[PDB]
Design a protein around this ligand. Sequence first.
Ligand SMILES: CNC(=O)c1c(C(N)=O)nc2n1[C@H]1C[C@H](C1)c1ccc(C#CC(C)(C)c3ncc(C)o3)cc1-2
Length: 291
Amino acid sequence: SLRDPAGIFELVEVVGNGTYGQVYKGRHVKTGQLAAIKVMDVTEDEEEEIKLEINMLKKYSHHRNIATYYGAFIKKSDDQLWLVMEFCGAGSITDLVKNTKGNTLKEDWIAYISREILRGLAHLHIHHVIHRDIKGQNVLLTENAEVKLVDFGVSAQLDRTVGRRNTFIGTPYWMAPEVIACDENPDATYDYRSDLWSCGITAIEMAEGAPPLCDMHPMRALFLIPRNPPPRLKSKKWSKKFFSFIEGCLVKNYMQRPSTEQLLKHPFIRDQPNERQVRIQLKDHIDRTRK
Ligand SMILES: CNC(=O)c1c(C(N)=O)nc2n1[C@H]1C[C@H](C1)c1ccc(C#CC(C)(C)c3ncc(C)o3)cc1-2
């Protein structure tokens, strides 16, 4: 039932990569409006599973902190599946830190971005959806400094032979301990609280420019996350509220880790006086980097 994108959408250039496939800057032919397009090689037997993934994307993307779902297309050739969503022109928060002097963001910026992540997560969690891949690369900015989540998990449940696009393991650095299977955790599953650990790692990334364990081989990092104590910010310059926020996100045992609603009520998230100027400071930084 998925039509060919010819005359509807066109690919302009590559903007990045997912765990599988590539993400392009795309254009709606008739209006010229931009859209981001996730292009992945798919076989004709993957079709039934993809249709189930589509309905999940459509249903839970209707929130201002989640990139909006536009539509799905199959470019016949293996064939290509095109997942069309809202374009977030200012790129990822990973790019934002990398393109800032000293590779560090102001604490009030971290507070604003983290709250927006948490609001997007709260919307997903209330609908029984775990994001499963929160990281700076999956947290995007638009031209008017709006924060949007991308690439929330839509797979599994069919017991089938997992399709090629779902056979890859991404980066481990933002993974919660409980998600990594070991001798004491044979069936390591995602809990909604696994996203909160990832949110905490993302705040360290905004603060230091890199997640903890960045100097290690990804396989070595995967082994250390379940064994290592909660990660900490290296500098002492940070406020007591920021250290307390990181502590909450990064409670080692997920069983005592706070919920998304509890973390949205944390003073570092809840008490944002300079909220108005932060959004202005971000918009001005977006334009400064663009040119
Ligand atoms: C400048 N923009 C981007 O770089 C940009 C944009 C975007 N939407 O603009 N999207 C991405 N990127 C980067 C590549 C990687 C991060 C990346 C990686 C994965 C994805 C994605 C995705 C899907 C599953 C299609 C989605 N998410 C939300 C919905 C409704 O559907 C998107 C992106």
